[PDB]
């Protein structure tokens, strides 16, 4: 990966030593970006609900993932499952189990640093995997994207600043997350996110992920051309809010 600092260096040092999940896949690949695109044409608000136990920030929520996922299946466009243990208190078994109970698309939220994690994602039943620009070299990024595409999955490229977007466009991304939170400082900047969203071309699937708590933000970002809107801690405390975000 790139030369890193703080907690990002650690989560990356650990992700490499993380051992694989070696068991055959037991569900089809259900395209998230494609279903999002369909939702837009169907005028439905597309929301990726996140099943994350603990924030990297550090504040846990213990709840049955199968009751959450099953509920979300009825409303969400897709499910983002946090599978990092140290800072996100998630696991591969939480993914495998959720993926066995739901039929909507599933996104693996992790710090992918090696090809095996992309095998893990497939095998466990994840429909797509998140690739963080801020955490990989350009050629590492081009390889993982290619590898995930050799599995049928269309990688979910996370950008944070105008530099991440430069590399994102250079690698040939077609599914972009515009993270309003800086991975190292853990701060939200909606001005910066909005600027970045304006710079991403029409043909690319856009996900505004930050600290979304109300519909008026989703309306605003939609008026700015974003396709899907990722919510986590807001839905992790109260999952029923989704009905209001859809409205
Ligand atoms: O906890 N998550 O499933 C999740 C998904 C996407 C994200 N982008 N930034 N943080 C994220 C967290």
């Amino acid at each position: 990966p790139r030369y890193l600092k703080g907690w990002l260096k650690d989560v990356v040092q650990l992700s490499l030593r993380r051992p694989s999940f070696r068991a055959s896949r037991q569900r089809p690949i259900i395209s998230l970006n494609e279903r999002i695109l369909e939702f837009n044409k169907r005028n439905i608000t597309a929301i990726i609900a996140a099943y994350r136990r603990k924030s990297p920030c550090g504040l846990d929520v213990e709840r049955d993932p199968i009751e959450y996922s099953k509920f979300m299946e009825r409303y969400a466009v897709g499910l983002a499952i946090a599978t990092e243990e140290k800072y996100f208190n998630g696991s591969y078994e939480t993914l495998r189990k959720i993926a066995s109970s739901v039929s909507i698309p599933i996104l693996m939220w992790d710090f992918i640093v090696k090809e095996s994690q992309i095998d893990d994602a497939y095998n466990l039943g994840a429909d797509t995997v998140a690739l963080i620009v801020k955490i990989l070299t350009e050629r590492e990024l081009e390889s993982l994207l290619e590898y995930a595409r050799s599995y049928g999955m269309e990688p979910y490229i996370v950008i944070n600043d105008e530099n991440d977007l430069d590399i994102a466009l250079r690698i040939g991304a077609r599914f972009i997350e515009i993270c309003s939170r800086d991975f190292e400082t853990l701060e939200i900047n909606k001005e910066n996110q909005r600027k970045l969203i304006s710079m991403i071309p029409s043909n690319v699937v856009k996900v505004a992920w930050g600290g979304i708590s109300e519909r008026n933000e989703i309306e605003e970002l939609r008026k700015l051309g974003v396709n899907a809107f990722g919510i986590g801690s807001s839905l992790m405390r109260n999952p029923e809010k989704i009905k209001e975000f859809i409205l």
Side-chain angles (χ1 to χ4, degrees), residues 50 52 80-82 88 109 177 179 209:
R52 178 230 281 157
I81 316 296
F88 287 85
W109 175 256
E177 187 190 292
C179 193
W209 207 298

Side-chain angles (χ1 to χ4, degrees), residues 28-75:
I29 315 132
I30 318 156
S31 193
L32 174 56
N33 47 310
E34 280 175 47
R35 195 187 165 213
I36 300 164
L37 281 169
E38 287 173 44
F39 261 53
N40 308 325
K41 297 158 167 294
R42 224 182 313 176
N43 281 233
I44 315 169
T45 298
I47 282 132
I48 315 169
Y51 185 83
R52 178 230 281 157
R53 228 100 68 181
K54 193 209 289 153
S55 31
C57 324
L59 208 116
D60 214 348
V61 184
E62 296 282 314
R63 134 211 305 288
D64 180 55
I66 310 305
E67 231 155 25
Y68 186 82
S69 280
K70 283 292 290 185
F71 175 75
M72 286 314 181
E73 198 187 25
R74 305 202 281 121
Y75 302 93

